[PDB]
Design a protein around this nucleic acid. Structure first.
Length: 117
RNA sequence: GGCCUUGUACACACCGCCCGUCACACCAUGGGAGUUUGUUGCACCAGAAGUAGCUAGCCUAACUGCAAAGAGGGCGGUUAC
């Protein structure tokens, strides 16, 4: 709430009301809507959350994964309608908010310990 | 000019035989700044399926228990090769 009240009021009418709770270090599956011509489908993007920005309507989160030996990161905009659904598959145990150090690790070294209730 | 003997790689028989460089044509081959293929010795990194060990997170038909739940099993995690 660092913006003017009118801007806050305009942003508040667009907020999603069903996002789950998730934190950096988790692994999530994001369903993205893909539109080809008139063909609508859902595509899954599964990976580790390495960064999360909490800014209301301007909230975002970064997901990193390995695809056919190539690392790929996508910075999803949380409240965009393109993100159909977010599932939390596993909860991780980390010590910091941003996990950019995972970019320099591979395979076993990049494993994240599971957070145990 | 004639006879005997001797040496010879000459026998078309010394107008013999025959050697090497240079020039010409062909053939195989050695060396050579480098270029490139296969294979291999170490040293390290990464590492699947699989097997062996340890775990206690989760889930559970046959057994035990009046039942609560145990035993056993499975998934997961993890170490070695």
């Amino acid at each position: 709430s660092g913006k003017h009240p009118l801007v806050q009021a305009i942003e508040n009418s667009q907020l999603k009301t069903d996002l789950p709770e998730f934190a950096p270090g988790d692994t999530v599956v994001v369903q993205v809507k893909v539109k080809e011509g008139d063909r609508e489908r859902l595509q899954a993007f599964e990976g580790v959350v390495i960064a999360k920005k909490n800014r209301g309507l301007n909230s975002a989160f970064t997901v990193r994964k390995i695809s056919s030996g190539v690392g790929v990161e996508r910075v999803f905009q949380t409240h965009s309608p393109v993100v159909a659904k977010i599932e939390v598959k596993r909860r991780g145990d980390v010590r910091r908010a941003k996990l950019y150090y995972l970019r320099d690790l591979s395979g076993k070294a990049a494993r994240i310990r599971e957070k145990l209730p």
